[PDB]
């Protein structure tokens, strides 16, 4: 967002997390 | 694995990661 936020990758799968800048 | 590794969720090209303890 620069900030690099970490968020849950909203999906049917295994506890994925993304780095949103 | 304790340690917490951020492995890669190869299930997308958006930078998702998986916590591997
Ligand atoms: Cl997920
Ligand atoms: Cl991804
Ligand atoms: Na992704």
Experimental technique for the deposited model:
X-ray
Q: For A1-21, list the strands marked E by DSSP.
A: 5-8, 17-20
B1 alpha carbon to ligand 3 midpoint, in Å? Answer: 23
Which whole-number Å values give the CA distances from A19 to B2, B5, B21, in the listed order?
23, 15, 19
Per-residue b or e along B1-21, where b marks 16 or more CB atoms closer than 10 Å to that residue's CB: eeeeeeeebeeeeebbbbeee
Q: What is the Å distance from ligand 1's center to A13 Cα?
A: 4
Q: Determine contact: A14 vs chain B, CB below 8 A.
A: yes
Residues from chain B that touch A8, judged by Cβ atoms under 8 A, are none
Q: What is the resolution of this structure in A?
A: 2.0
B19 sits in which H/E element = strand B17-20
The three-point CA angle A9-A6-B16 to 5° equals 40
Give the C-alpha separation, B1 to B9, whole Å: 17
């Amino acid at each position: 967002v620069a900030l690099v936020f970490a968020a849950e990758d909203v999906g049917s799968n295994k506890g994925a997390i993304i780095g949103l800048a």
